[PDB]
Amino acid sequence: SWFVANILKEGGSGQRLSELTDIKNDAENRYADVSSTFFFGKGLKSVPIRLSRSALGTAERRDSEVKPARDLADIWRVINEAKTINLPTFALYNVERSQPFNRG
Amino acid sequence: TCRDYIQNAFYLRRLTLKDFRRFSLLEIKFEEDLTVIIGNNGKGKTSILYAIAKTLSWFVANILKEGGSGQRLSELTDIKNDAENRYADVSSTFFFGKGLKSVPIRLSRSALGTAERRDSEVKPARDLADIWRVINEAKTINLPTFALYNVERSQPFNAGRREERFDAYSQALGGAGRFDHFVEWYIYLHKRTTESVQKSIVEKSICSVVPSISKIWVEMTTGSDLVKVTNDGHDVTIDQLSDGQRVFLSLVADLARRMVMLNPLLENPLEGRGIVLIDEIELHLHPKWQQEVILNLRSVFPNIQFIITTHSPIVLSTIEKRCIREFDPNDDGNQSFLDSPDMQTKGSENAQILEQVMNVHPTPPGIAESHWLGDFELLLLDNSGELDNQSQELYDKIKTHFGIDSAELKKADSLIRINKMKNKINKIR
RNA sequence: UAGUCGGGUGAUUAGCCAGACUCUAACUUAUUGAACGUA
DNA sequence: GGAAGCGAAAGTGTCGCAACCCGAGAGAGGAACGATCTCGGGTTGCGACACTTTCGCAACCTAATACGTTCA
């Protein structure tokens, strides 16, 4: 979601873990950390990200390291503006895609 | 400080719109008292009032809540579809007293996929609104009364969310006023009876601004409390009033209630400051009411700014030409300014205003008889200022159609007399 | 197969030789600070 | 640590829209007085949004230094 937000607009904002339903209840840290690393070739062989969130009520935030995502998405967006390029597709099809066919 | 020099005018000065809703670049100056926009039926003028309402929403958001983020522009509608810039800016300057004579604001919005996040610059307006909020919290201070009233106010007609101060800003912008909230608030005031003076102020307000209405009260019948007025001497309910009568009553009563809650420390809470936008002040009104709407509005609200659109010559006949802002009929060639009419309008003939300011002839051209009188003139001048068969027939037609006392017939008689005297003196000279 | 280590040619590329493969590289930060040089 | 502005995440409130009731009302169809069918106000339910709130991203760097590399 941060890739998507920062290709939509520089300085954008992406989705965030929850301080009510995303941190293990038995945990002693009282914060969750989704670290990740992407790859985009020899140039950017490692694109780290870390979506971290502390537990509601604990007086210790946990910053998120999305800056490399900001940087790579900045490249995508700026280069697309200057000249047209092909952007990366991001999708999530969970169980919610089952819904009645009700009738930007 | 005298409440931080607040209790000094408080109004809007300028509005720039760049690549925003067909406005390639349009700068508008606004008068401290009253500005009126004409030329369009309310397409670009609605855009102007909508932009001003978006700007005022930030003042409201920050006076209500600390850090409040008022309404933002929309990436989907509030950006000119054809703009190499690919962003839209709505800049606006304000003037608040001798100190802080220029409070700027910009609401910016860039399309999706642009390198720089073209961003609103609302810091100074937020700072002023925070000054308002803080000094009010420390000590009570009368606050601005922003409002908007579009054609949506023509709509048919909880103590916590109607009696508590700062409810005056709830849905204050966005269009149609909350007249149902006013009805409930007025019934609550009547139940309570400071509330007394507020009731009296609202009563006098809508009794004086609205010609038909002459009194207002509520009957406390057990099980149903009704709001009643004396419309043309008839004791009726609000549901009985005509469309124009009740629509204007709702406008004025919503505004007055907002000002009464916002301006508790004024001796006349109707003289508090604000910026009220009113699309089509002439809605559902008849010429006689048109000829007094603005006089009454300015009388009951001595110190307040009105940005009101209009398309009625009778309305303009009561407003100085400086206050008027003309859209050109060829606005497709986007223009950067709105020039005042060359002709003076205040105190002028409604017919002259209609003919020149709006380019509408005093008599319709679809009616053949409408041209008759004028034709007669030419015909008289064709035959050396003397009658012939054609002019005599035209005179007979005018006399038959318009009547014997007809102003047209009197003017035809004057024309023939003047031309005959012309010929007689030419012979004598 | 793939990645990887990096001996020469050619000139951060290309390209010829070797090789090895715990599920499993991703080359970093300057003026501090070590270490290299240089003066 | 965090400005300025913006948006995510979450929670609460608004408010159409529907469902349903409860009198009226012209008058079956033939037996008087009027079944049914409607016209309305009006109350309650009910969920889709609309607004309110908090969190959190990360600008900035009176006090350095100024041969070239490497490395935290």
Side-chain angles (χ1 to χ4, degrees):
Chain A
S1 61
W2 290 84
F3 284 163
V4 167
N6 280 261
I7 195 159
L8 286 172
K9 95 187 162 73
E10 87 87 43
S13 199
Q15 280 142 46
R16 313 170 153 203
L17 314 181
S18 156
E19 33 181 333
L20 287 173
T21 68
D22 262 325
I23 299 150
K24 162 182 289 253
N25 318 45
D26 320 324
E28 205 35 282
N29 269 338
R30 303 319 297 128
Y31 78 85
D33 153 27
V34 181
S35 313
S36 189
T37 84
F38 296 70
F39 165 99
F40 189 14
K42 312 179 284 196
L44 236 190
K45 280 184 188 178
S46 163
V47 199
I49 316 184
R50 165 169 92 90
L51 262 74
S52 164
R53 192 72 182 259
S54 170
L56 175 133
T58 55
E60 301 281 353
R61 65 175 201 258
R62 283 286 296 189
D63 215 279
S64 317
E65 274 64 28
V66 311
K67 315 100 189 60
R70 296 185 177 287
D71 309 350
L72 178 47
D74 292 1
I75 310 201
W76 266 317
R77 161 166 42 64
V78 175
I79 304 276
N80 174 49
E81 297 174 69
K83 216 178 184 290
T84 313
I85 67 188
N86 305 327
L87 306 177
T89 307
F90 303 113
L92 169 62
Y93 301 115
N94 68 338
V95 303
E96 266 69 352
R97 64 194 201 273
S98 170
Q99 64 224 324
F101 178 64
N102 300 306
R103 300 178 72 182
Chain B
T1 65
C2 307
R3 305 289 182 74
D4 217 46
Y5 297 106
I6 293 295
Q7 294 288 293
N8 294 317
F10 305 93
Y11 64 101
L12 172 85
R13 292 218 272 91
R14 208 177 83 180
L15 175 79
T16 324
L17 312 168
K18 350 180 181 177
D19 303 304
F20 158 86
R21 285 194 182 169
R22 318 160 222 100
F23 290 152
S24 186
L25 180 270
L26 187 123
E27 181 223 77
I28 311 152
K29 264 292 291 279
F30 290 100
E31 279 83 342
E32 158 169 34
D33 294 343
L34 199 131
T35 327
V36 60
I37 309 155
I38 82 183
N40 203 297
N41 199 245
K43 140 168 203 180
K45 318 192 288 195
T46 43
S47 305
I48 288 159
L49 296 189
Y50 165 75
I52 301 152
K54 283 289 190 191
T55 292
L56 294 165
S57 61
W58 292 90
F59 292 86
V60 189
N62 282 85
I63 171 156
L64 285 163
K65 205 46 50 188
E66 34 280 32
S69 289
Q71 270 153 63
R72 314 190 131 91
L73 298 187
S74 166
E75 294 95 354
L76 308 171
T77 169
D78 308 344
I79 290 170
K80 183 167 209 161
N81 96 315
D82 190 352
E84 309 253 11
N85 262 280
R86 305 296 282 310
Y87 51 112
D89 323 75
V90 164
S91 0
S92 100
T93 310
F94 282 67
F95 181 110
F96 296 106
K98 302 178 185 180
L100 307 177
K101 285 194 177 174
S102 186
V103 171
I105 219 164
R106 188 187 32 150
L107 304 199
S108 320
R109 215 72 183 168
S110 41
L112 296 169
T114 65
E116 272 90 9
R117 191 189 69 184
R118 191 80 186 178
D119 186 308
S120 308
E121 186 162 357
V122 298
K123 173 53 170 68
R126 286 189 36 256
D127 187 356
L128 176 64
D130 247 13
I131 291 162
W132 270 326
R133 158 193 83 71
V134 174
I135 68 192
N136 177 49
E137 285 180 9
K139 270 271 217 85
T140 324
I141 62 102
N142 319 317
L143 309 114
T145 84
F146 314 114
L148 172 64
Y149 295 114
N150 331 302
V151 298
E152 328 310 354
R153 71 184 189 280
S154 61
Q155 269 172 26
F157 306 126
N158 327 313
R161 298 169 164 300
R162 276 139 149 134
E163 316 232 44
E164 149 56 3
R165 193 182 189 206
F166 279 85
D167 295 328
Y169 289 111
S170 54
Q171 281 91 55
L173 310 164
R178 284 229 81 92
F179 185 56
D180 40 18
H181 280 223
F182 164 73
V183 168
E184 289 315 317
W185 175 73
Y186 197 65
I187 304 139
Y188 286 5
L189 294 176
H190 255 128
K191 311 236 153 288
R192 291 178 182 284
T193 312
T194 298
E195 45 255 34
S196 169
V197 289
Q198 304 183 337
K199 157 190 170 292
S200 295
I201 304 332
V202 190
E203 288 172 349
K204 292 169 29 65
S205 163
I206 38 63
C207 282
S208 70
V209 48
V210 201
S212 312
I213 282 76
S214 84
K215 193 174 170 183
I216 199 158
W217 69 85
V218 307
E219 301 146 17
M220 45 44 69
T221 297
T222 306
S224 181
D225 296 333
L226 281 158
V227 163
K228 306 286 292 301
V229 286
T230 305
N231 198 267
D232 309 56
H234 291 79
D235 298 347
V236 306
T237 58
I238 302 162
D239 322 88
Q240 316 226 62
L241 302 169
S242 188
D243 277 4
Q245 287 164 313
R246 86 180 151 66
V247 161
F248 211 81
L249 170 66
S250 66
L251 192 150
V252 175
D254 209 36
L255 192 53
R257 170 181 81 100
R258 293 170 177 167
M259 305 207 33
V260 184
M261 305 182 258
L262 291 171
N263 294 278
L265 308 109
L266 292 180
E267 321 320 340
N268 181 346
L270 307 179
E271 85 205 316
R273 307 290 315 196
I275 301 169
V276 174
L277 324 171
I278 299 175
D279 209 21
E280 301 182 347
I281 195 72
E282 72 274 9
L283 189 68
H284 301 321
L285 306 192
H286 51 290
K288 198 70 172 242
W289 204 347
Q290 295 179 15
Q291 205 179 76
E292 209 188 317
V293 273
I294 297 103
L295 284 52
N296 294 119
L297 285 169
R298 299 282 338 268
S299 201
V300 281
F301 308 133
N303 310 292
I304 220 174
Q305 177 179 16
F306 277 102
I307 299 90
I308 79 190
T309 90
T310 278
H311 72 177
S312 50
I314 299 151
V315 161
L316 296 191
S317 150
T318 50
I319 285 152
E320 313 193 14
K321 76 166 171 184
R322 72 177 161 86
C323 297
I324 294 162
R325 296 283 183 275
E326 298 170 320
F327 274 87
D328 298 345
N330 297 320
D331 188 65
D332 289 349
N334 181 263
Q335 68 208 29
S336 64
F337 217 43
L338 299 179
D339 295 354
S340 268
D342 59 332
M343 98 161 273
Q344 179 60 283
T345 64
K346 189 178 182 185
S348 180
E349 301 310 43
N350 305 332
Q352 286 307 320
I353 297 166
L354 199 49
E355 223 293 306
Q356 285 153 27
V357 175
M358 329 213 177
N359 316 86
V360 159
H361 290 308
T363 67
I367 305 302
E369 291 110 42
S370 182
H371 304 299
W372 272 354
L373 175 60
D375 262 33
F376 176 55
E377 235 167 47
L378 283 311
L379 231 57
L380 193 58
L381 301 178
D382 191 8
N383 193 47
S384 304
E386 300 291 328
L387 286 182
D388 51 14
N389 84 72
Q390 278 78 26
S391 70
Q392 182 60 53
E393 175 179 350
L394 217 168
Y395 186 78
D396 291 351
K397 289 161 102 217
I398 298 152
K399 157 152 47 49
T400 297
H401 188 287
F402 297 88
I404 214 63
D405 172 280
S406 151
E408 311 240 340
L409 196 63
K410 288 185 174 181
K411 294 166 183 186
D413 161 36
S414 181
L415 280 153
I416 175 164
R417 257 273 178 154
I418 267 66
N419 268 240
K420 257 201 176 46
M421 177 192 254
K422 253 31 181 303
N423 274 42
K424 175 176 179 175
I425 220 174
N426 160 279
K427 291 178 182 184
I428 294 165
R429 198 180 64 191

